[model samples]
Target: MVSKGEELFTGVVPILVELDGDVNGHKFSVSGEGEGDATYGKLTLKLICTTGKLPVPWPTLVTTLLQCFARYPDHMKQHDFFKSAMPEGYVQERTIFFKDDGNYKTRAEVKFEGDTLVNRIELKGIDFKEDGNILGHKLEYNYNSHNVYITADKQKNGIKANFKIRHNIEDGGVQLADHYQQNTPIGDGPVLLPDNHYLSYQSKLSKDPNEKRDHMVLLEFVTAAGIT
Candidate 1:
């Protein structure tokens, strides 16, 4: 079954943070699949943080900062907090994607270098892995898998960044046939396909199950950055 796409995921990533002379580096990565104009799928994100300049307590600092950001909704207050307590270089990454056009994903990477704010943009392409084993089922999916490198200079207004994305599809997996329906029963009896089969069965069996139909689509985002 096909359904219209909508907003699938939204998030933020801190690429680099520097307070005084202390520095920390973090990397983020994500993978998933989706359908329709909006991608709906499972997302798996991995973050790796490293000690950059000094061994300052990053875990405590980050947790406290995140709490403050979450608890306080005022943007001015957040800015004041950053100015007074975290007066240093801070870089953040953001991305948004629609379900169909994975090739033209948007990235908005922002950074506060000292008192100056720097913004950068880059286009990233998605990689496709067909007929892969997902939850013991053969399915095809696309993902944004790439490595981004960033470099900052004192004279430059913004940081220099570039990405290298993987293009080749991996071997070993059954290609899904054109007639394959993810929500349909594969071989009759109790064996149903893993894509919202319960909802499919309910829609078919119930007199008044619910007003909504569950269209299983997948979406995911992953990113990583560090001081180089």
Candidate 2:
């Protein structure tokens, strides 16, 4: 029994799963319903359940981390990577990193784009606060990011996640032409952070006191293909 918020979160959560269970071995996938038109469509997405825990008392909570890989044209090779080092969700938009003091009490938002595989996104009105006072603005990724993917990992426990992320992030923006021109063979293995760092847990709970109940969970992921 998944809720609407949980479904949306499933659209952007970053943390793929791999299991040998009947669900076809803890796979990374997405499920949702949509209906509308070229202007807009009402999409209802449902993330897979986590390990095991009582149904969360509240339902507004959301947590997502999308790992967007740069434009990798070779679908075959990428399919190999997906076999293990997959992700929960991915996004492409003008990314911004405004105020930064560690505590991400900042603000973020997303605009609804028409029905399409690679939808348009905009980040506005982000307040990255500083010492008692508001600081600069958030870093924006200005470009028509033509790629967006999402997934959700469910455990019997309590853990529902949502959010888009950037994958294959390297020093500075690497262009696709240069990427293929480099002639460097693509790597294999499980997915990881920028420097190939494995993530075991994530936190996106609200810090606002007014918010009734904040949700949090630790995600466990593994790849049988084994990444290096």
Candidate 3:
């Protein structure tokens, strides 16, 4: 539990403020204005304590000023720190088609980056082309439109993606063979074999007993490879 009295740096750091330990003696202010696509601000601080004197051990004096004024604007909806801490998980599989012509196929990895989700693109996968900008440089991202864009300088190694994405959850199981474990029964039950003598996989979307439970075996091998 966080103590109500405990001080927090809030979302913004290095902000300015005033502090007077004396009741009614301290006052602090943070002011900012947004103009066009830019923001401007000023910070002011003063420290006076209950003893009616400056804090001893000047370090204590500085620390108090920081605690009282480490605030973020109320209008803000998210903090960069917390946003960066958001769990990074796979969002979808994206295939980039190069206009130059080749059947090269590779799946791009899209991951949450605390503040944004990003994926790097290249005709030859990411061997030479790294996704996004170097770590620490601020970038932007959004899932708002048909395509997602990450902030990057136009002439440099930036990541700009425009493609269709299919989330991993909604699948026809076509790619399961490439990453499935044929050795282990997804569940102990009727299974498959290699068809040299034996072989075969579903979900229980239908409560009906006739519904397939081994999706990969039934949907993939049955439709794509089964000859007899």
Candidate 4:
């Protein structure tokens, strides 16, 4: 049975479930009741249970319940929870590097504007390589971009970004008139990029078709205090 009413709890009440039944010859009934407290974002629950001729030991039953409750917090504190809590803005730090050399190429703090989901990014060099044989120009550009949450499931969620990278001449002459635009798909939350090249560009000057530049990238959630 389910019931809802105004002022049922002192604060925000998200979800509550009451259980009672006989399972595999074990007879038991359970219910939880309490007022919610918004200040601390907490809910007090009183578990009332009655059992007769229990099939499982009391300790095992209690341990199983405790383990189930332990996972509740993690499940509750997902993307939507934080997004609503931080209406002012959201920030993520994006890093790009070479998988083969293990050297960082560029880093940027991408701050999503309130509600618009749009941002302006200024990529900064971390360990810029001067080798002429390197793929593409040194990472340095300012551009407008946007990010969005695409898919979600029990295993993982998806995030996508529309960004741009400018191509420059090796000799520092006139800027090449074209830009490389990418729609990068990423996993939501702080995660190492999957086994795929985030960015790849064939050398414009190389005659061999096999000569190309590849980069790996990662995204980490950032808080007002610091990167997490």
- Highest TM-score: give the candidate number: 4
lDDT of 4 by residue, 162-210 (tens): 2222333335532221121222223133321221112111111111245
Judge candidate 4 against the unseen true structure and give its global Cα lDDT, from 0 to 1.
0.25
Angstrom error at residue 52, model 1: 46
Sorting all predicted structures by TM-score, with the top scorer first, yields 4, 1, 2, 3
* Candidate 2 per-residue C-alpha lDDT over 92-159 given as tens digits, one digit per residue, 9 for 90 to 100: 22222222221121121221223222212221322323331212212221211221222222221111
Instruction: Give lDDT per model, in order.
Output: 0.22, 0.22, 0.20, 0.25
User: Can you write out model 1's per-residue Cα lDDT over 55-122, one digit (the tens) per residue?
Assistant: 22111111111110111112212111111212222233323221222222333323333432223333
CA RMSD for every model?
A: 23.7, 18.1, 28.1, 24.8
Error of 2 at 74 (Å): 11
Those runs of model 4 whose alpha carbons end farther than 4 Å from true positions after fitting are 1-17, 21-23, 50-78, 81-227
* 10 residues in a row with least lDDT, candidate 3: 215-224
Candidate 1, run of 10 with poorest lDDT: 195-204
Best by lDDT: 4
**Alpha carbon deviation, residue 67, candidate 4 (Å):** 13
Please give the TM-score that candidate 4 achieves against the real structure.
0.23
TM match of model 2 to true structure: 0.19
Question: What lDDT score is found at residue 52 in candidate 4?
Answer: 32
Reference-based TM-score, model 1: 0.21
